[PDB]
Amino acid sequence: QGPHMSIDEYKSQANESMANAWRIITLPNWTVEKRGTVRGDVVESRKVEGFGKVYRFTGVVNCPARFLYEEFKNNLTKLPEWNPTILKCEIIKEIGDGVDLSYQVTAGGGRGIITPRDFVILRRTALLSREGRVVDDNPHGYISSGVSVQVPGYPPLKEMVRGHNKVGCWYLQPRTVQTPGGKIEDQALFQWLMCCDLKGKIPQFVLDVAFATVMLDYIVHVRKFVAEAKARAEI
């Protein structure tokens, strides 16, 4: 344990956040908010004391879970190149054990329901077993969790709302399938937990549609990034 270390505070909050995201994303009783266009794609929600209403997208992506995991872990600044909803992404600092601070500017929903917002995110990216324990190899799932924090030097901009992520994560599980042609290929069950403090006072019903829409529009960009990696023989 480090003395006079604000880095222990950052690493502590990232671990607490990662454990909370894994624990929330694996909770059993969910309410369907919206079904997606691709079969099996769903946005669900549920109440969690301390967090309020949380949202969860679940869908299958045709690529190894490890490949997507590697892009989220090591190439987060390249996120705007293939996901238009991310206008800016920069790493603030990397502080060990898969933990980093990043600045992200997100775009609005288009309908004007969710306006563009910026974020200062504390993140932990790790390999997990079935009981939520951090492993060095043979993982059951791959997590990349985030929570909003304050970083001196990244204050709220007067020109933009500083959003607040209470609990969130990308969670990927490897899945090897038999295709209709008989081939054995690697696939990934992809889940995205979202819980944001907007700041506004718009009814819960209209924001349920807004958040589900954001989630469904995101998976389209992930599948396009995946389809290009497939075509250019990277997967």
For every residue of 163-222, DSSP letters joined together read -EEEEEEEEEEEEEEE-TTS-EEEEEEEEEEEEEE-SS---HHHHHHHHHHHHHHHHHHH
Question: 169 and 15 in contact (C-beta within 8 Å)?
Answer: no
User: Cα–Cα distance between 15 and 12 in angstroms, integer?
Assistant: 5
Check: CB of residue 126 under 8 Å from CB of residue 134: yes
Resolution (A): 2.0
**Rounded Cα distance, 114 and 163, in Å:** 10
Q: Where are the beta strands (DSSP E) in 18-163?
A: 31-35, 42-48, 52-61, 86-96, 99-106, 117-128, 134-135, 141-148, 161-162
Residue from 172, 193, 164, 171 nearest 44 by CA:
193
Phi, psi dihedral angles at 218 (to 5 degrees): -75, -45
Instruction: Specify the experimental method.
Output: X-ray
DSSP conformation class of 182: S
State the residue for tokens 């038999």.
Answer: 178
**DSSP designation for 93:** E
Here the tokens at position 180 are: 């209709």
Can you say whether the dihedral through the CA atoms of 98, 19, 17, 77 is positive or negative?
positive
The DSSP H or E segment spanning 24 is helix 6-25
- What residue ranges do the domains of the chain occupy? 1-235
Any idea which residue has 């490949």 for tokens? 67
Q: CA 141, CA 191: separation in Å to the nearest integer? A: 10
User: Would you say 157 and 31 are in contact if contact means Cβ atoms under 8 Å apart?
Assistant: no
Give percent helix, percent strand, percent coil of the chain, each to the nearest 5.
30, 40, 30
